[PDB]
Symmetry: D2
Subunit: 249 residues, 4 copies
């Protein structure tokens, strides 16, 4: 009876750059109050918020280390824009490791950022969201959870766990809070990818095209706008998870 965007405060983790920024600015331009979470990118976050507010939107910046104490984060956000109703678990760490050379410190960091904190923030959002309001969690995962391979060993396991948690969180938080996910494919070159590498990779996707940045915010809004959807994921990935031509064929 009150799901208008002005009454749906959003918290986007790692929201000051790249895909997180694209989600923040999409939601803010559609009338959602947005809390831009960041850690290192505070300058960028404040600039985004100032631009939104000067344009007549409603945005704030909140700062927290997602590998430390995140127990005040939802409250820092709700103190500024009201009880968080839509949580986008976007923040990420994407470091390579391999079976045979596993460093468990890096392992722990992947699981902290991609699994522990998203679950904790979902819990905290649920606890603080008034009972007459429904909520939504959107987890940002990775297309590779739908096409497992042995590279990026601990990273992959932590993102796969976030996809597993999307189902079990959805079951646990139903009916009042829905939990869905986005699995990006090659969207913006990683730190290890030259432009040639990103382009060659995109040309090898089944759709031969990268997800465009507007598709991410549109998908969050799609999940918000269709209340029968929970426990589900859209891969914005150019078909990557459906790639199939292996050397044995």
């Amino acid at each position: 009876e009150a799901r208008m965007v002005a009454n749906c405060p959003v918290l986007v983790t790692g929201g000051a750059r790249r895909i997180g920024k694209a989600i923040v600015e999409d939601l803010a331009s559609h009338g959602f109050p947005v809390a831009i979470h960041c850690n290192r990118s505070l300058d960028e976050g404040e600039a985004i918020a100032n631009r939104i507010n000067d344009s007549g939107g409603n945005a704030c910046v909140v700062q927290a280390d997602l590998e430390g104490d995140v127990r005040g984060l939802v409250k820092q956000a709700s103190d500024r824009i009201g009880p968080i109703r839509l949580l986008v678990n976007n923040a990420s760490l994407f470091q390579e490791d391999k079976v045979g050379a596993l460093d468990m410190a890096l392992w722990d960091r992947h699981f902290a950022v991609h699994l522990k904190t998203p679950v904790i923030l979902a819990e905290d959002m649920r606890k603080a969201l008034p009972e007459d309001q429904d909520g939504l969690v959107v987890n940002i995962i990775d297309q590779r959870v739908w096409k497992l391979n042995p590279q990026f060993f601990s990273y992959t396991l932590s993102k796969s766990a976030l996809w597993n948690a999307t189902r079990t969180l959805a079951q646990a938080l139903a009916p009042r809070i829905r939990v869905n996910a986005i699995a990006p494919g090659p969207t913006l070159p990683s730190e290890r990818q030259r432009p040639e590498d990103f382009e060659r990779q995109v040309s090898k996707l089944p759709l031969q095209r990268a997800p465009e940045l507007p598709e991410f915010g549109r998908t969050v809004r799609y999940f918000w706008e269709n209340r029968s959807i929970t426990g589900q994921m859209i891969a914005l990935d150019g078909g990557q998870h459906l790639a199939w031509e292996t050397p044995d064929i």
Copy 2:
């Protein structure tokens, strides 16, 4: 120019219930729409009349989808232009079970749910000019994500449509994308009084049925976000995620 006026739609079984809801959403958004029907000709003509009298572009085409369908796409494209968006909505839903399988009904289930969607998709591909991308949306059933032994041949035929959603997406990439909607309980069934439908809905994880507007919104969501192929959204109130089975109650 992917403007909706340049995206003719064919909806099979589009004169009633979910198919009608999809037709009317798309036409209200500026898509030219071909309403396929079989027994519901009067209903389909009334819909198309209302759309055309409103300044839209609609027509009605007839075919028994258990027989020859190889002229159906052309019936539509002769009226509204090359079909660019195919919604395989038509369905037959008749109970059978292991122990008393009648292969005549089995054949009808696979005709409507598998042979026809595949043939129409290929016919759409052959007639759609190479400089236009296309979309197929298959309407399946939440149960393909939570297999059970009821409605035996119906279920196998719908599961096959979900399988074909993936291999069609792989075959028709990059130019044509193939996605799916898996409905849950949307409207009461035969021998289901509204009280009965409500009691079943209350046992869904989200305790709410998909509403008809969600179907058109989902079709348009697939149309507008070009990185999605081979995927399905269950508009089902969480039904495929139900988990309280007798072994754990």
Copy 3:
């Protein structure tokens, strides 16, 4: 084992033959179904019977009416308690060159016939005996690709039916499956499998007996495929 009569479809050559001869050496009565390989089936049955077993040959075109086949077998070796749906048709087609006659044949041999034979087995199974169906599918149903379009759809449906048959036929009959990889033509392909080795014929009979001997297993599949369904280095990864 002599209490467990077996029907193996397409049992006269290659993988079916290897399953037949394994089970026969372990004391299972076996009915060898075949169509074109009648002389080979009779030769296998003769060796089994000469060596003290109990084998027969039954004939049927599995693209047509198969409703007498289980009884043809049970008339000779007793009510069937182990059904191996091994027979297969493997012809190439693709979207955009679809021949529906071939499509119908793939679905007849891989889906309609396995289900009907399972249905007949269930109706004939004595009350005091449990049963097992083993469907022979294909590793590709665990790594979908668009090649061999109607063949793949029909094998995927057999895998779907393995689950729903298992649900429908419990507790009396368990329904499991084997997903073969490249067993017989090749040599270069195998080196590209993750295990760099092909499944060997003894593994198939060992797997059928494994399913028989462990009664808590239903609705499940083993891929004897050298890891083929786990292949992952696709063009976007290289």
Copy 4:
């Protein structure tokens, strides 16, 4: 040959782990019985094995601490480990809304971190002219997800995910497969009468028998084309389907 395939079974002193150890040892495998608390049960099992002419030893280690000497302990006594059964488990309840990360961490340490580390150490110490096998003992619930036992389930689901990616990483020389038990023996919190009612509600209406577990490890060992896969010894539990929205 099984005489040339030394086995390490984590948590092998009781219940399912004991069933696996005794099945393998009685079939000619040298068996390193790992335990932590159940040292008396462990030494007893191995002594009965040895007295019977088998070849068993007991290695002790806390799987949540330094496990980097455990494979060495085993292989010092019975030769380089060729078959690792990651069976050790912790099964404690939590749920969304009251999650304590200390328990969460233990679930992931015993079900994911340690199985992966031990597999890593096995591959390091296995002579290159020998192939190997890892069998992860998981849980049928990874094939029928539900929101109960939240951190436990996530950690078991991770072990199932790792079964695929370890299989891809360690191929061709080492295979990685899994067993997903259903209701086998009542838990520290489940009454026998409740365990029986649960079994009566399984699709097959019977629990796995303890011999099925060792038979399954031996099945994986004897059939060299199998990797990255799991058998659920669960009486059909993961296939149960009649929920209140249908029933």
